[PDB]
Amino acid sequence: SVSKANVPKIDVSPLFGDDQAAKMRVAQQIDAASRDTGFFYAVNHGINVQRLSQKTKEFHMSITPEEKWDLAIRAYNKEHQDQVRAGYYLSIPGKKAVESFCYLNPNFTPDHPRIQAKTPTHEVNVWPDETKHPGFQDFAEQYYWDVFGLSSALLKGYALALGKEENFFARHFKPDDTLASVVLIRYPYLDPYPEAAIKTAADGTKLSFEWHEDVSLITVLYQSNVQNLQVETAAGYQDIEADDTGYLINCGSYMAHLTNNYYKAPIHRVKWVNAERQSLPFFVNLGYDSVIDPFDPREPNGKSDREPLSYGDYLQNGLVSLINKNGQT
Ligand SMILES: CC(C)[C@@H](OC(=O)[C@@H](NC(=O)CCC[C@H](N)C(=O)O)C(=O)S)C(=O)O
Ligand SMILES: [Fe+2]
């Protein structure tokens, strides 16, 4: 068998308040988890995840094939050349099992300055018809702001953990320009499950998605209570237990770059499981021009031999590279 990964449950409620000492004790826990397996569960986070799962299930089980083509990204529908990130990512029965819907900042409207300039990685969200999916757009936009609020609190914890002031990351994570995305992923139960939709790791483990590091500053994930994720540690790939009451948090490769690998972006993968389940990540991305000067918390002067990288440059290059490595989702 595979050993259980050490994934501590951290009560992050002090990060929403004004007790500075309490916030430092949470930051220490984040530091420990970031230096160990790289994963932790944020608990006492204040978000109604049962309602999120219910609203997402109502959407996934009622959307029709017609609506999926009408909302599809350009990888599936050549008529939609402006949709690279936002929209519907179709399944391919007999070949690709997963399907999903991605949306970006609700403030990316037609009049937004970055939308007017046609700056890469910024798009105006696409939504299904209101009469067919009553309340879905409003729920989904409010969810973006609820998880943005949790993510801002978590970024204060990471900043304190690295010896910085609490707004070190959060000052670059703003409602008017964040490149953060929500993905509503559906993994289906299929009988017979297409072998073409199952990948096989070098160690023989059946997978739905291969090893990778995330393209994010941090990733804030809600998933159904079905075990599936694995993390590579020095002692091999270990199973991350499921917890559908908490948010699973890990660092992405932008955090590894900024900290000179002090907080590594953990390598992880998704096991194949024949179960109807949900995976709802929020990728915490900064603004297009956000540049944080790289540093090293293990060195006395804190200097690093890494060059500054704008978040926009990092993101555009990273999303393409992940598709090339592990396939179009
Ligand atoms: C994190 C979860 C485990 C989940 O995995 C993902 O969402 C997969 N991310 C990407 O494809 C990047 C998607 C980027 C998105 N289109 C965007 O423009 O911002 C990762 O495995 S990370 C899953 O499969 O359960
Ligand atoms: Fe990931």
* Secondary structure of residue 121 in the 3-state scheme: coil
Which residue is it, tokens 């397996």?
37
Distance CA 45, CA 85 (A): 28
DSSP string, 231-247: EEETTEEEEPPP-TTSE
* Secondary structure of residue 289 in the 3-state scheme: coil
Q: Which ranges of the chain does DSSP label H, i.e. alpha helix?
A: 20-35, 49-62, 65-71, 113-117, 136-161, 253-258, 311-326
Question: Ligand 1 pocket check: which of 101, 187, 209, 218 to mutate, most ligand atoms within 8 Å of Cβ?
Answer: 209
Distance CA 26, CA 58 (A): 36
Cross-strand pairs, 277? 187
Go through the domains of the chain in sequence order and give each one's CATH number: 1-329 (2.60.120.330)
Tokens of residue 133, six digits: 């999916």
Q: Which ranges of 180-227 does DSSP label H, i.e. alpha helix?
A: none
- Say if ligand 1 is within 6 A of residue 91 CB: no
Selected catalytic residue, list 268, 282, 283, 295: 268
Asked if 212 is an active-site residue, the reply is: yes
Q: 41 with 7: CB under 8 angstroms?
A: yes
Q: 164 with 258: CB under 8 angstroms?
A: no
DSSP string, 85-98: SSEEE--BTTTB--
Within the chain, how many helices (H) and strands (E) appear?
7, 13
Q: Is 279 annotated as a binding-site member? A: yes
Ramachandran angles phi, psi of 4, nearest 5°: -80, 130
- Say if ligand 1 is within 6 A of residue 100 CB: no
Q: Is 158 annotated as a binding-site member? A: no
Selected catalytic residue, list 122, 133, 214, 257: 214
- Say if ligand 1 is within 6 A of residue 183 CB: yes
Selected catalytic residue, list 209, 282, 283, 295: 209
* Secondary structure of residue 247 in the 3-state scheme: strand
Ramachandran angles phi, psi of 266, nearest 5°: -65, 140
Q: 33 with 10: CB under 8 angstroms?
A: yes
Ligand 1 centroid – CA 281 distance (Å): 7
Q: 305 with 188: CB under 8 angstroms?
A: no
Tokens of residue 99, six digits: 């399907």
Query: Which chain residues have CB less than 5 Å from ligand 2, an ion?
Result: 214
Q: What 8-state DSSP symbol labels residue 15?
A: G
The experimental technique used to determine this model is X-ray
Instruction: Look at strands 199-200 and 229-233 and give their pairing.
Output: unpaired
Resolution in A: 1.4
- Say if ligand 1 is within 6 A of residue 181 CB: yes
